[PDB]
Ligand binder design. Structure first.
Ligand SMILES: CCCCCCCC(=O)OC[C@H](COP(=O)(O)O[C@@H]1[C@H](O)[C@H](OP(=O)(O)O)[C@@H](O)[C@H](OP(=O)(O)O)[C@H]1O)OC(=O)CCCCCCC
Ligand SMILES: CCCCCCCC(=O)OC[C@H](COP(=O)(O)O[C@@H]1[C@H](O)[C@H](OP(=O)(O)O)[C@@H](O)[C@H](OP(=O)(O)O)[C@H]1O)OC(=O)CCCCCCC
Ligand SMILES: CCCCCCCC(=O)OC[C@H](COP(=O)(O)O[C@@H]1[C@H](O)[C@H](OP(=O)(O)O)[C@@H](O)[C@H](OP(=O)(O)O)[C@H]1O)OC(=O)CCCCCCC
Ligand SMILES: CCCCCCCC(=O)OC[C@H](COP(=O)(O)O[C@@H]1[C@H](O)[C@H](OP(=O)(O)O)[C@@H](O)[C@H](OP(=O)(O)O)[C@H]1O)OC(=O)CCCCCCC
Ligand SMILES: CN(C)S(=O)(=O)c1ccc(S(=O)(=O)Nc2ccccc2N2CCN(c3ccc(Cl)cc3F)CC2)cc1
Lengths: 455, 455, 455, 455
């Protein structure tokens, strides 16, 4: 039994010396790295084509339909007078009606198909306002029924000019229409072009009732297969990836089964559920997970190429994660050699103390996150949302973008002085505490762990 | 006595094992974290509504009243010819008179009400100039009485076109008016809209007499309750927060009282005002302070919701600080376990040596601050004020925004070469000294303190 | 033999004390630093003149030929309507025909000379489209022969106005022409001006068929000697550099030969190919390589000055690399003194363990590179290409540009939420792993190596 | 003798306990910090007034005289057609002639006074071109006499329209004129306004002959006292600063004299010029230097206030440096206490090894500086000059602005691929070597020095 256990933990070279066993798993891992990386790049070609089509069409829509739009102005684009708002609305509708004559793209109109369009209608121009809206700031009074009433005008593709906006109780104005186009660039990748439908929404938003009405354009893209097109290998490579990952999965499962059997034998021969886990190869769990992800991504990729699916983002995430895991998994064979295994050995020693330290640090970090989000968020562009606040604080801990964070508040030093002073205290205390105390101790834990495994 | 003292310092689990005492304080602390954080977010909704209303109205005013204004131009917006200045002034007044017909907001005029407005006047257009102002650069001479004379023209809401500016002795021109509006967006938060009065000040500033007259617009917002409005739970949650914090305050006060009594007994039984303080729980002082802040903020929040107060900024600071303290205070229960208490133990060991080190470092830091502020401030955008200089130097110590700091001075290398050379020496010496000597020693102090408490 | 070996490893001062040997190599090294640095600066003058001529002419071409072009707009410059595209094309051609009357430069036309120009033609205006291009998005159908057909119109320098673009199957439009000019600024450097031919390509690119057609201008510069010009020391300095480097090369080769002979004698007297290499001076290998590079660069520089060559970039790389190596090589004489040799001794001790550590780290780094490039590249401006991804990740490891990297993805939080969440996980995991674990261990290896050689 | 030597090195408290000596120097140092800092701020008021006047007038000149100028465009402002250049030149001259009617400032003309103006002339419009300039790129030939000929047109203040530019051999065009104005804002500081003369130079630069002619405006300001002006304490405070610094200088000189006498006695009683220097107080040398600088700056400040001098920059440098030294000098009294003297003790121990390390590091740093400056400077905005290259490399060592440095070269990846690859190698090697090897060893030296003096 001792000999078999000693053999179980031997390295591939040692196992070869003992039983002449071929290192099939190692060769499979190298081949997997190569083929999985190549597959990811090949998929990236199609993924890029789709993303580019959507984005470029959206930019073209912004230039075509938004009066006086220019690049980079999305965040500030707004109307400020009644005349400006009417001109923007009418320009959008007129450009919609003129699209076949002016656009560099080839678009087809879509009619009907449910709300907000009536049958035969291509464009819906809707204004939403309060049901009852008497507003008299001169007498400091108002009488409001806040139920929202929607009034829509339908425009057929080639009356809307009589639109009368109820400015004082207006909630918003929207323009809805759909356009069909063909992603011809796919021909460059030897793929059949797909048929895209873009749902275009233009919003003139008055929810703040502040005298400033921001204007935005958004699109939703739906991909469908075209009807019997005509155009005057990846399947085999995907099959090869499937077979390599399947063989790897089978071999790793066999190894895990043998490990479980040996663990059972060792426990039985002992005349704690921590020494048993020493028979479990975590690297093989990782390899099995990566094989599962790779095969799922490859099947999804085949489905997309066959035009049964269009979930490019999910497929890209699956294949990218599997590629990273495949590259990482080859470290399993460096664990047998001390000089090459510093990172993993240090991680194993350090992880418990690091997690215990994080227990204390996380409550402080979260307290700062919530305080900053709510107090500074209305005044500071970097504190708008909780995820943004976490990004800002994490970057500050690493010394990044610090003066700019201070300078964003300098405008409030004259306007809201108390908030400015609080922001000073908040930023100085956070940076000092986390860079000089917390991070130093974190690094000290890691380097001490390394010191214990140095020799 | 020994048994009672040993019981006093036992952990919640140990106290339970001894006397079966329930950990009421710990459960209260967890509940407090939850409810205080939720209350802060709920308050943030109303706070954001108010701040957004003010800011958006101000941006709309800039676009409405400043001729040729565009976003991002606030710092450089200026006039350079007499014709430009007259056109800007007249455009502001004309837009004020046209506001009801052109604006997307609904505004009401305000008349009279003291200086600078006469009774019945809505807009005051004032020019301020020297009492006597003979200026003859051709003969290198002047005769000035610098007493400022103000001349104002009053405009009623729906003669100012005859304004004649005394350019050569002009100090500034101001336009003052007030507008009333209603913050309707509060309806989305199930709140009754408030009535806002915006005091608008437009300044054409000639104090430098340099041929460039910067133009700015500023607003002051005053919030009042509207007169008998009509619109076709937070109070209970605030009450719950009050009760949780009150119970926590009472329990912590009881613990502090028992600690004081035990300290008195121990001192008396000894047949220095440093060993006595070992009977004082600093965490309970922190909890009492946080309870006081939370209750004050909650009362202020209730007052604001009832429309008796409008101090959003103070309330936000109170509630945010209390939220951070509540999150931090739960660390008290990790102090009983060495593996989880590294940060606090290191802080306690390190603080004295760190403060002594700061004694020496602070004088150097302040010397650099003053020197940079006065010598480089007129030439360097990052050295304009003392607080800005401290922000710049602190960021430099952390390696942030360094090349940009150097590059701001590169323009003076041809204009003011001596100042450029001095700035080179200043920046290089500061960065070298503080990053490589001071900060290294600071971190060494902290990690040495950690080394002493490692085991 | 022992005495000779002991003498071989003596320092220059010790060798002087032993045999009175003059330190010729050291003086040569100092002289080399001086002359090589001066030569590099003198070459930089001519290199700058050439680069400036090319760049400034290209900017002028962009302003002359691109309708409505402004600085900084290169990345977004595009057409969005048929009318815009036609106007841009015709403006480019009209400006080409008007160049002699409007341009501040003096340009000569080039005719014929092969494709795409016919004989006598100066400008070629070509449109490229699909051979068969029926596109019917209304019926979700198409019939395409993707073979590209090119149709070109030839314009002689002082019919193209009848150009009819096949928009629905258009691949791109190009404008090709060549202009000849003379780089007169070389007179300021006492050089004879060269004759430049600029090949100008203007591309209106429709390969995405997205309704947005980006417009770009690119130039290729060909330098030739002018025909018998008339204009109403560096050769000697280059000769001096050649002689200094040649003498240094000869002395270093002699030293290497003596070292090889001594190694042979020592091995023979021993009644492993690692102890023998201790007789090889790596510094002398470096010096020989630097001499070779310096001489090659100097010969190339002489050829360029004589106008036999025009390879400014290659010459600059040769001379710059040789200058860096010459400056570095003087450290050879600090190796004899422990206090001055910390860097080299630490490097020698640390290199093996560092390379072994890199073996493990590189696979993780590459996995992250590929995953980020393919998954995030279509959405993130910093992940467009593999080299850019490596630049971004390497900068992140050093704490640089981190918040901006996070913020680039914040736009997708509403559009592509799954990709945004993946980007969050990717960035947080990469930064945490590499800054806090990998880099800490790397630095620990280096400082431990230094600890071993401290005394 | 032993007792006297022991007393010599005593601390102020010990000297008080020994002989009851009053700590006059310490009180003087505190008073000096206060008064010198206040004096620096008071001077900063006047310094800011002067700098602001110059800068604002220059910006106004740019807006008045440069056709189509806007803020931030200085680096790219240029002409590209003959018509543009003529319009810019004529606009500048026309605005000069119209200045009294259009400008918001009050300016007086200056006539004559030597070259380039003739007597009675206010504006000089000069074109500079080659003496002989035949340029024929069509035949690849030229005939040039590069002697520069200047032709000037004189304009009196209220023929230049017939200007004919020799475009093909034009070197540049300049416009020179002077304007007199009065810095009235000084009244706000209770100072008499000065009389400024601005020398304005407008350059249309064609030295590159590239078809792009950059346009710039520069000013030189000369300050003079006005002739018998009329306007309808700092001298005493400056006197107080002088007296405090003089008393401090005298006391420090007395201390240095006593130290020298004691050193002589100790050496004589010994029946090396390193033990003798232990009798020299370096802090007192620093204090004497700071007193000298403070007094010089105060005398210069008095001269400027009296209007005998106008050297604001030199005075500001003197006073700022003296302020920093005064703040630093109070550390002398913390040297007597080990806990407060960590920084100085560590510096004293570390300096020799640090300087020896710098000997080796500096040659590598300089090699990189020269190589980068010459090879990358023409392509990279951050490598234009040697000082800029040093700024960039120093910032990179601290991890600052790294991705931007990489990204500046990404444009050459298609244009000049070899230079791009070299830049990749250069940047990666520099950053790796200096951040991970050099800086780590530097910090290790400093922290080891601290370790030696820890106890
Ligand atoms: C008796 C059990 C059931 C039958 C098992 C039959 C054999 C089978 O399945 O794989 C054997 C090897 C496995 O290849 P591989 O997994 O690389 O090899 C095993 C591992 O090295 C394992 O160590 P760890 O990796 O550390 O767990 C070791 O304990 C095993 O020795 P042991 O056998 O003495 O226990 C090896 O057989 O693979 C081939 O030799 C070709 C694979 C197919 C190639 C197809 C090409 C078209
Ligand atoms: C005799 C003194 C006056 C009368 C005191 C009567 C009791 C009273 O007030 O609180 C008792 C506990 C306190 O709860 P809590 O404060 O969590 O518990 C105490 C702490 O654990 C304290 O340790 P530190 O936290 O380290 O200071 C410990 O010394 C005390 O033991 P001791 O008693 O032997 O000294 C505990 O009683 O709380 C409840 O059991 C429910 C509270 C109300 C819940 C209302 C629900 C609606
Ligand atoms: C017998 C072998 C063949 C004949 C060799 C004849 C001599 C010859 O070539 O160079 C001698 C020195 C070399 O100058 P240099 O190379 O500086 O000097 C040698 C090195 O110091 C070497 O040590 P490393 O540098 O550590 O390898 C050392 O072992 C040699 O001693 P050794 O001789 O006992 O072995 C030295 O001669 O150079 C001149 O003295 C002037 C050079 C020309 C100046 C021209 C001015 C216009
Ligand atoms: C016999 C030598 C010539 C005559 C010297 C006469 C005395 C004179 O000049 O200063 C004495 C002190 C000096 O003040 P101060 O310099 O602060 O005091 C000296 C220092 O503490 C010195 O130590 P270090 O600072 O470490 O070098 C110490 O050795 C001297 O002791 P010693 O005398 O036993 O050597 C002290 O006298 O200053 C005043 O007591 C008022 C100053 C004027 C205030 C004016 C107010 C309007
Ligand atoms: C940046 N690192 C510390 S570095 O990468 O290790 C390094 C890089 C370059 C050089 S240098 O010698 O070429 N010169 C140099 C060039 C450009 C800017 C600064 C310098 N030095 C100025 C002197 N400074 C110094 C001296 C004594 C002490 Cl007590 C403390 C100090 F900080 C060290 C920096 C050395 C190290």
């Amino acid at each position: 039994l001792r000999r078999r256990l000693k053999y179980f933990f031997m390295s591939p070279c040692d196992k070869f010396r003992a039983k002449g066993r071929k290192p099939c798993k190692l060769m499979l891992q190298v081949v997997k790295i190569l083929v999985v990386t190549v597959q990811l790049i090949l998929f990236g070609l199609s993924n890029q084509l789709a993303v580019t089509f959507r984005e470029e069409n959206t930019i073209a829509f912004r230039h075509l339909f938004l009066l006086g739009y220019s690049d980079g102005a999305d965040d500030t684009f707004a109307a400020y007078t009644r005349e400006q708002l009417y001109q923007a609305i009418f320009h959008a509708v007129d450009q919609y009606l003129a699209l076949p004559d002016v656009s560099l793209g080839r678009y087809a109109y879509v009619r009907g198909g449910g709300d907000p369009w009536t049958n035969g209608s291509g464009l819906a121009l809707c204004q939403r306002y309060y049901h009852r809206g008497h507003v008299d700031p001169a007498n400091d009074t108002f009488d409001i029924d806040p139920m929202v009433v929607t009034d829509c005008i339908q425009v057929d593709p080639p009356s809307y000019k009589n639109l009368t906006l109820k400015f004082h109780k207006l909630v918003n104005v929207t323009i809805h229409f759909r356009l069909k186009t063909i992603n011809l660039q796919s021909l460059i990748n030897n793929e059949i072009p797909d048929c895209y439908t873009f749902s275009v929404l233009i919003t003139f938003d008055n929810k703040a009732h502040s005298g400033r009405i921001p204007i935005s354009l958004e699109t939703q893209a739906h991909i469908q297969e075209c009807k019997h097109p005509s155009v005057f290998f990846r399947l085999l490579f995907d099959v090869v990836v499937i077979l390599t990952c399947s063989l790897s999965f089978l071999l790793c499962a066999r190894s895990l089964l043998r490990g479980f059997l040996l663990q059972n034998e060792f426990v039985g021969f002992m005349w704690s559920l921590w020494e048993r886990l020493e028979f479990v190869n975590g690297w093989y769990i990782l390899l099995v997970t990566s094989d599962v992800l790779t095969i799922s991504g490859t099947i999804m990729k085949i489905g997309i190429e066959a035009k049964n699916l269009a979930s490019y983002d999910v497929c890209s995430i699956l294949l990218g994660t599997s590629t990273l895991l495949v590259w990482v998994g080859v470290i399993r064979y460096l664990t047998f050699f001390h000089n090459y295994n510093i990172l993993i050995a240090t991680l194993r020693v350090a992880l418990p103390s690091v997690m215990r330290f994080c227990c204390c640090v996380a409550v402080i970090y979260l307290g700062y996150c919530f305080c900053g989000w709510i107090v500074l968020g209305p005044y500071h562009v970097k504190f708008r949302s909780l995820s943004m606040v976490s990004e800002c604080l994490f970057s500050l801990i690493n010394g990044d973008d610090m003066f700019v964070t201070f300078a964003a508040m300098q405008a409030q030093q004259g306007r809201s002085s108390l908030v400015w002073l609080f922001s000073q205290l908040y930023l100085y205390s956070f940076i000092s505490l986390f860079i000089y105390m917390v991070l130093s101790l974190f690094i000290a834990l890691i380097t001490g762990a390394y010191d214990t495994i140095k020799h």
